[PDB]
Amino acid sequence: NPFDAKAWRLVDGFDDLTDITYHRHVDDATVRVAFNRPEVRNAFRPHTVDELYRVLDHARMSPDVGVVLLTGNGPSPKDGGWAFCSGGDQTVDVARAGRLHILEVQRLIRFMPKVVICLVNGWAAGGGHSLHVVCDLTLASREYARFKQTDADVGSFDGGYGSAYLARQVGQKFAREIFFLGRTYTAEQMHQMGAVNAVAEHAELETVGLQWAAEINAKSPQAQRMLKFAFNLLDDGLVGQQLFAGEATRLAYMTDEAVEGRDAFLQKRPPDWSPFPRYF
Amino acid sequence: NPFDAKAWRLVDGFDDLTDITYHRHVDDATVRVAFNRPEVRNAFRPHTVDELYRVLDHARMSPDVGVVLLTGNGPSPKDGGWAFCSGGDQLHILEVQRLIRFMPKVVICLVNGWAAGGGHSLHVVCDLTLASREYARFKQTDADVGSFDGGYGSAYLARQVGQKFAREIFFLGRTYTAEQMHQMGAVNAVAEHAELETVGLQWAAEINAKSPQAQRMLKFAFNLLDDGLVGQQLFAGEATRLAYMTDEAVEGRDAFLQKRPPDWSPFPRYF
Amino acid sequence: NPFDAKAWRLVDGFDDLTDITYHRHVDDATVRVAFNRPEVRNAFRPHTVDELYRVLDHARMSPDVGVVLLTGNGPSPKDGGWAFCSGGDQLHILEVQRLIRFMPKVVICLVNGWAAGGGHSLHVVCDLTLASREYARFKQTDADVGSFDGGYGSAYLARQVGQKFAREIFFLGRTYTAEQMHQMGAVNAVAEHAELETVGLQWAAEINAKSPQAQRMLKFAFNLLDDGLVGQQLFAGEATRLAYMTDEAVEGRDAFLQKRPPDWSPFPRYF
Amino acid sequence: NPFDAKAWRLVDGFDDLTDITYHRHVDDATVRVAFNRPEVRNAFRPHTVDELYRVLDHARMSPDVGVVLLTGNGPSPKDGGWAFCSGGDQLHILEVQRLIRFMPKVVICLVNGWAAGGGHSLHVVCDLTLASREYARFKQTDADVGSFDGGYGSAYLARQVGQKFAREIFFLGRTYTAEQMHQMGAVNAVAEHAELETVGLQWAAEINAKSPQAQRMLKFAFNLLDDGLVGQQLFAGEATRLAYMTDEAVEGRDAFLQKRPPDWSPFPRYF
Amino acid sequence: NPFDAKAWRLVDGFDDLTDITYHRHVDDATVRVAFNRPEVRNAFRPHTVDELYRVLDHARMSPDVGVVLLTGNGPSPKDGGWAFCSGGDQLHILEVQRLIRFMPKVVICLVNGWAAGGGHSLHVVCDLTLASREYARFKQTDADVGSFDGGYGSAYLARQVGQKFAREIFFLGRTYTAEQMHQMGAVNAVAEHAELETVGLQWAAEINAKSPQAQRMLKFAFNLLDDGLVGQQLFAGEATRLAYMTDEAVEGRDAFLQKRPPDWSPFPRYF
Amino acid sequence: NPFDAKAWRLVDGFDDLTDITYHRHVDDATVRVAFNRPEVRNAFRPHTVDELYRVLDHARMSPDVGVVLLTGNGPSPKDGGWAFCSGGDQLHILEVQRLIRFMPKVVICLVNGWAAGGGHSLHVVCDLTLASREYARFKQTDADVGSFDGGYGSAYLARQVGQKFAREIFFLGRTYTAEQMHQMGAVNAVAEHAELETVGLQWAAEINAKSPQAQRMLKFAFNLLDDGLVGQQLFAGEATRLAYMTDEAVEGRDAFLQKRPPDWSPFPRYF
Ligand SMILES: CC(=O)CC(=O)SCCNC(=O)CCNC(=O)[C@H](O)C(C)(C)COP(=O)(O)OP(=O)(O)OC[C@H]1O[C@@H](n2cnc3c(N)ncnc32)[C@H](O)[C@@H]1OP(=O)(O)O
Numbered sequence A: 001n002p003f004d005a006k007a008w009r010l011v012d013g014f015d016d017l018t019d020i021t022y023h024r025h026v027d028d029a030t031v032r033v034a035f036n037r038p039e040v041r042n043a044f045r046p047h048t049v050d051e052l053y054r055v056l057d058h059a060r061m062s063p064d065v066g067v068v069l070l071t072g073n074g075p076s077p078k079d080g081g082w083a084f085c086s087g088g089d090q091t092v093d094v095a096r097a098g099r100l101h102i103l104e105v106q107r108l109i110r111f112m113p114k115v116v117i118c119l120v121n122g123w124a125a126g127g128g129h130s131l132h133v134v135c136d137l138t139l140a141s142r143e144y145a146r147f148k149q150t151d152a153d154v155g156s157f158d159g160g161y162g163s164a165y166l167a168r169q170v171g172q173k174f175a176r177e178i179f180f181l182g183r184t185y186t187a188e189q190m191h192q193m194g195a196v197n198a199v200a201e202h203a204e205l206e207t208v209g210l211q212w213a214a215e216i217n218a219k220s221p222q223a224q225r226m227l228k229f230a231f232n233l234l235d236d237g238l239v240g241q242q243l244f245a246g247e248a249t250r251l252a253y254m255t256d257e258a259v260e261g262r263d264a265f266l267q268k269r270p271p272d273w274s275p276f277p278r279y280f
Numbered sequence B, C, D, E, F: 001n002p003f004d005a006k007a008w009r010l011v012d013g014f015d016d017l018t019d020i021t022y023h024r025h026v027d028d029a030t031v032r033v034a035f036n037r038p039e040v041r042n043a044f045r046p047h048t049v050d051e052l053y054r055v056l057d058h059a060r061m062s063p064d065v066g067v068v069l070l071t072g073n074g075p076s077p078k079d080g081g082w083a084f085c086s087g088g089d090q091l092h093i094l095e096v097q098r099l100i101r102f103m104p105k106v107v108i109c110l111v112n113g114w115a116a117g118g119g120h121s122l123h124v125v126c127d128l129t130l131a132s133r134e135y136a137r138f139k140q141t142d143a144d145v146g147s148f149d150g151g152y153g154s155a156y157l158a159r160q161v162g163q164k165f166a167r168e169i170f171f172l173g174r175t176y177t178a179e180q181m182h183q184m185g186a187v188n189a190v191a192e193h194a195e196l197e198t199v200g201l202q203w204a205a206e207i208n209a210k211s212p213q214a215q216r217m218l219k220f221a222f223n224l225l226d227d228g229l230v231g232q233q234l235f236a237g238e239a240t241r242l243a244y245m246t247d248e249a250v251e252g253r254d255a256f257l258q259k260r261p262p263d264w265s266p267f268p269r270y271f
């Protein structure tokens, strides 16, 4: 079992969680967010997404958290099988019911100024596959990671990050193959294609996760933030620019030049820009 | 005063609002969301942003609301001056920008006074803008104080007025009238100050009289390329929803639960 | 020989074909489209392009065809050498590229031999590529002769193998095997020469066993952003088709013919 | 009536046209392509699109034609009303849009009356638009009936009038005059109704007086980035053709046929 | 005459200039760079481009210069005619385009006369354009002579005036006035001929009165997406510079030199 | 030692170089440009960037040079360790990045040792990379010291190795071998350390054996979309050059000088 209880502490205020677990590391700036429905191959129902959102949002807003490990608990108490996430659990009520609340989760992972590593501990199918795709990094169980894009089998499709963004990891030929055929791939296979960063022994998956997390946390958090947004930038168009530029704005705010401008507004005087040069 | 009290009721559950007001129209699928700090030219402080987010987010999830009217209350009790919003009280706001940008409803900015700094950037990111002829004033002051909106406020502005005018708006930081902004392409239409919300409601009614499904697809179709993968994600998400409703997708869902092979023969290969 | 005659039937109406062959599978929703000039390493002359266009266009419009297998016949009767296609016989081809790119079905290139110049570019633009272990040979010779595919052949290759490999492939013009191209990212899988079309058929069957609607949307989703407005046009066009089938769109269409106002109340504002 | 019969001759081979008319000018390298169902406000049915496609394709491949004038015949024999095209008779059309977009000739839309739905979208995708002052009426009705052009009709319109105006045009579905659309940026110029085709022909004459090669390159240069890989394919295709004509390309071609190594010494490395 | 000699002093080190003049304002952080061949309508020959490059580069690297005013001297001593620049004397210019595009300062083109061919394209690539009411004439003649600017001259012009107007400007090659280009969106404002440089200086002064850091970021924010990886490279480069000045970045630099591990505890994870 | 002295001669005019060396090959159209501070792991100080820029610029303008081999001299006389480049000595480098990116010749990085920080990023932006099996070490250390290359170093690396591997390279800052970077897609090929430049020269020779015109066009085709309007500028610039050489463009040029109307009748409208 990848989960090492000794390493994790419950996060305050999340006692009511049923479909998701949420831990903070005993020492490191890292959290563990996991699907907690192993009986159903960790499929998400609307309540799961609600909880996932809440938890990830909380982790986004925690200034002492640098890295999110996104995984699935297991194994299944019914048949011993391992799953990361098998996707969606298969008049005012109607709009609130049919949701794409998962697309919001995808955006949350994409936009949060911290690194999200998906630890694929088992089946990653449909929406669960797409969650892995959108995470920044992926580490996968050698013995048990299974990647299967089953959307088209049931008449569904992720026409967004699940597919188009996958192509920016494995290239257009591989990505089209993954969706068009819906075959099952191992960790090593996906690693060879370029969607999985590294493969780890099943029982060491979270240990390797934590080691990756610690290497990320050992660097300047400002740089890591800028970096994530630089990687996102052009692919995400104006949104990519908005988030990168937003960090540039924050950096500028801290400078002497920007204090001068702020001062002179409050003091009703003209600003003096003579101390600060025109860099080229 | 643009505000017609008879047309609006408060939305239940928002009694604690201090910096923002939130009304639903008496008949129409339209809400009114307004800056409520006219003494400070409707500048937003962090608490203002929190409320604006919650309010817009509630509007987003309200299935019986089709259109958001985003405006500012006034005038100033202190000097009679009018403001839509003067920007930050001197990153939560980027979240608000994205909320407006991604919400599957049309957001109309009603610029009833000054729109400056972040307040200006809020108008730019809205789908449509109507502006008070007498009182709307557009001023991009960011560079004055050493700040800049390097996102929707600037780059997206350029996709409305073109690259020359947008550079000018930000580089010089001049004040512009409703009619000028209308010529440049950032203001849809200009209205008599007192009629601004009347015109807003009329525009809202025309938007709400159309297929809601169509309107949502269209918004996302306009966002799509500009917003890259996020734009694709949102438009494709709506396509996925449409596909779920079809007989073909029922068959695929059936056959999975029934453990049998799916039959695709009834459904043709459209070209 | 990869070709299994028992598996294929000629398609009606194409008796006049000289440079290209065209078969429909005995059972499956799949066609076989093959260069038929093995004596000249399956190079295309203008008349080949004409036929290739007609044939691919026919396949595009055949509602009971889900997958196109694109390959080359052989071996050469003169020297026993194998070729998928060696390029132009030494702009109509750009049109064929676009047909392959825009058609709402999966095109698998089966590289059974040399794939050089334009023939290499044809492989690149297909959705998928399966290549003969023993005989697939990839060579971008364009620059040797003072020519260049500055479109899908090069820039799109880069979106398969990455910018360093794709530059390498064109700047040096070296010959690569199936396995090398598979390592690089341009070849989906390698198959024993004699089993190339058997594998192709198995791939085609797995593709055809899924929702045709989903496959169509997926293809256009993969093309979308890379193809800009054209990508959006094709994907959105499929969304439009999906919308037309809904109850909401029927109401809009009814109310127009019946001269009445439409009622949108049964249909919610999804978010 | 904008139509001057003395200016135009029928094109050989199109006697069977029912829903479209097709003329070549008596002296100029200009054709006239027109919707010919004035009784239904020039709505296109599936047969209309077939004809429109064939006709436009023929013009594309006519080497002595430089400019296409796309318009509508009228007025209505039933009520005297004028129409360019009112859209679908209440996806072949997406092919026509691509034909207009990709053809290496300038297509000028002459909006002589109503331009609604798909008919509005056809105007948008043409390179240029001239509009009848008295009679051009622009109405984007799609969302009224639960439909939407999520491609060139909307996203490309935004690249003419900007994102604010474009959203307005679709969200509200109002009717706009020639001069309003001119102000917004989607109409190049307004003409007196009766002079519409005369102005059309003068614009065409100015276009045809320039280097055809340059006009080609320019159209694809304007298309390029908007159309992503497809845009690049077409612009680079023209660059390939230009390269083929050079002495350097001749040397490369010679040396392959002559089985010798090529000599690149005469041709310098430009920078 | 727009030129006020009292306002300007020569820049040290440029006494060998023949085709270009280069002045620094007596008080303001503004330079005047001007074509100096009014006898040939300020056409640039390869020696002009050399000088223009050197001069613009010097202004780029001058830390006390905030704004470049680019213009043409006149009138012609032969015929009294005025010109900004008539293009190439009948690829070094593409380098100048990029120098203007990438320089972290605002370049204002003051079009005091004819701006044709390459001269038109220089105006298009500048950040802002102010134009002589009586004498600015914009004419894109390239296709007349079988040439074309397929880069910033055309594609980027479409990002100011929209795709319909930009296509018109190139395809017909008509002559436009200052006020027409102003209505289209390619000219920021129109000035009395005699006051063109005075208005230029006032605009410069308003630009120079704002945070230089902010203006730099803004320019690159406007260029960013349009310029793809180059746009990102420049904006990101400024972000890198900003980061270098922070306490966090000092800690990282210290710990490397001191061979110790860095401590990031003081600096929070902003969101 | 990869360096074979007998193969290289110094370039005239560069005897003042301290931090960089610059050789022309004795026979081939290939230059060797090399960091020359092995004692500090070939880190670049501002004077190094100055020289690197001048040298690369000179190679760009050398008509008789087709390929630039960019590398690092060694080993360290202090410790025997090998380096390509260790980054900045602990924005002029962004200029060098652009010079490599825009130059109309293939730049091959020969990573003969450590390639860290800025030095890693130089290797990323080169067209091709060959790496020493035993000594190439790739390590993106930026975030360790609170820095980042948010441009080509990172976003362009993702278009070589894909988004997962690129994020990993930067977020963890681990050290990779030649073979690992080869598997990822950032290194074209791996060579025996002592054979590194020999293989470089052989790659160079294959590049220089093709049509330089075609190589130029290909490099810009690969850059194009990624570099937005800059990529279009450069590609289009080459297309303009090609057009200038044609008969059609001579005709347009003639008729302007001769004051006559041009005749376009000999030149057809290709499609
Ligand atoms: C909004 C969205 O984002 C949409 C989506 O992703 S929809 C879901 C993804 N697509 C699918 O339909 C595939 C669903 N999952 C599977 O294909 C397979 O379960 C799998 C390949 C992941 C693993 O299969 P397996 O190892 O053979 O185990 P399997 O027997 O199928 O599953 C074990 C149990 O969990 C359940 N289960 C697995 N995935 C489920 C899902 N997505 N929803 C509901 N239940 C699911 C099964 O019903 C099965 O339950 P029973 O004990 O009642 O028989």
Ligand SMILES: CC(=O)CC(=O)SCCNC(=O)CCNC(=O)[C@H](O)C(C)(C)COP(=O)(O)OP(=O)(O)OC[C@H]1O[C@@H](n2cnc3c(N)ncnc32)[C@H](O)[C@@H]1OP(=O)(O)O
Pocket: A265, B039, B040, B041, B043, B078, B081, B086, B087, B088, B089, B090, B091, B093, B114, B115, B116, B117, B118, B119, B139, B141, B142, B145, B147
């Ligand atoms: C996170 C972000 O998004 C960042 C931002 O936008 S920062 C803010 C935008 N940029 C600025 O600094 C400009 C601020 N606003 C202004 O320039 C001007 O107030 C205006 C042009 C909008 C209108 O000015 P005006 O009609 O002359 O009235 P003015 O006297 O300036 O304002 C009236 C009062 O409201 C206040 N006010 C106006 N804007 C304010 C703001 N952004 N923050 C705080 N107080 C503000 C003033 O202090 C003034 O208060 P007093 O009664 O104490 O004197």
Ligand SMILES: CC(=O)CC(=O)SCCNC(=O)CCNC(=O)[C@H](O)C(C)(C)COP(=O)(O)OP(=O)(O)OC[C@H]1O[C@@H](n2cnc3c(N)ncnc32)[C@H](O)[C@@H]1OP(=O)(O)O
Pocket: C039, C040, C041, C043, C078, C081, C086, C087, C088, C089, C090, C091, C093, C114, C115, C116, C117, C118, C119, C139, C141, C142, C145, C147, D256
């Ligand atoms: C519009 C476009 O799209 C443009 C293009 O691609 S142009 C073509 C591609 N570029 C070229 O010029 C390369 C052409 N092909 C080749 O380089 C080589 O034939 C090859 C590497 C593919 C295989 O070479 P090979 O195994 O040694 O066989 P090879 O002797 O060259 O070819 C066998 C015969 O077929 C012919 N052939 C091969 N390719 C041909 C082509 N593109 N056009 C015409 N004939 C061709 C040869 O003339 C040779 O014929 P002969 O019996 O008369 O001698």
Ligand SMILES: CC(=O)CC(=O)SCCNC(=O)CCNC(=O)[C@H](O)C(C)(C)COP(=O)(O)OP(=O)(O)OC[C@H]1O[C@@H](n2cnc3c(N)ncnc32)[C@H](O)[C@@H]1OP(=O)(O)O
Pocket: C256, D039, D040, D041, D043, D078, D081, D086, D087, D088, D089, D090, D091, D093, D114, D115, D116, D117, D118, D119, D139, D141, D142, D145, D147
């Ligand atoms: C594939 C696609 O691309 C989809 C589409 O565009 S669908 C069509 C566009 N959207 C619509 O439904 C709007 C249709 N057109 C109209 O709104 C209006 O006709 C108009 C605004 C263009 C002009 O209206 P008008 O001047 O008042 O004339 P109007 O009475 O409506 O039309 C005259 C006749 O032509 C017909 N007509 C007009 N547009 C038609 C259309 N799109 N399809 C079929 N018939 C049409 C009408 O039925 C009317 O016929 P009758 O003599 O039998 O009454």
Ligand SMILES: CC(=O)CC(=O)SCCNC(=O)CCNC(=O)[C@H](O)C(C)(C)COP(=O)(O)OP(=O)(O)OC[C@H]1O[C@@H](n2cnc3c(N)ncnc32)[C@H](O)[C@@H]1OP(=O)(O)O
Pocket: E039, E040, E041, E043, E078, E081, E086, E087, E088, E089, E090, E091, E093, E114, E115, E116, E117, E118, E119, E139, E141, E142, E145, E147, F256
């Ligand atoms: C690398 C690139 O970037 C390419 C380019 O732009 S190429 C140049 C642009 N395209 C052209 O060929 C147009 C050239 N210019 C013109 O069309 C016209 O001169 C104009 C519309 C700008 C003004 O015309 P005008 O007011 O009637 O004056 P005009 O008589 O034409 O010019 C006055 C003199 O300057 C010269 N001149 C004007 N433009 C010139 C140019 N581009 N190159 C050389 N000489 C030029 C003329 O030869 C004429 O000289 P003469 O005294 O010997 O007769």
Ligand SMILES: CC(=O)CC(=O)SCCNC(=O)CCNC(=O)[C@H](O)C(C)(C)COP(=O)(O)OP(=O)(O)OC[C@H]1O[C@@H](n2cnc3c(N)ncnc32)[C@H](O)[C@@H]1OP(=O)(O)O
Pocket: E256, F039, F040, F041, F043, F078, F081, F086, F087, F088, F089, F090, F091, F093, F114, F115, F116, F117, F118, F119, F139, F141, F142, F145, F147
């Ligand atoms: C503008 C920009 O573009 C910004 C940048 O890239 S900043 C620089 C890149 N990032 C860094 O700080 C990393 C610097 N380099 C390193 O991490 C390591 O030197 C290395 C991994 C490349 C190799 O390390 P190594 O094999 O263990 O040798 P190492 O002991 O570190 O270096 C040997 C000597 O060269 C020096 N050196 C190595 N890189 C240097 C650099 N970037 N700046 C200055 N000196 C450097 C060291 O100080 C050391 O010197 P001493 O003899 O005085 O001790």
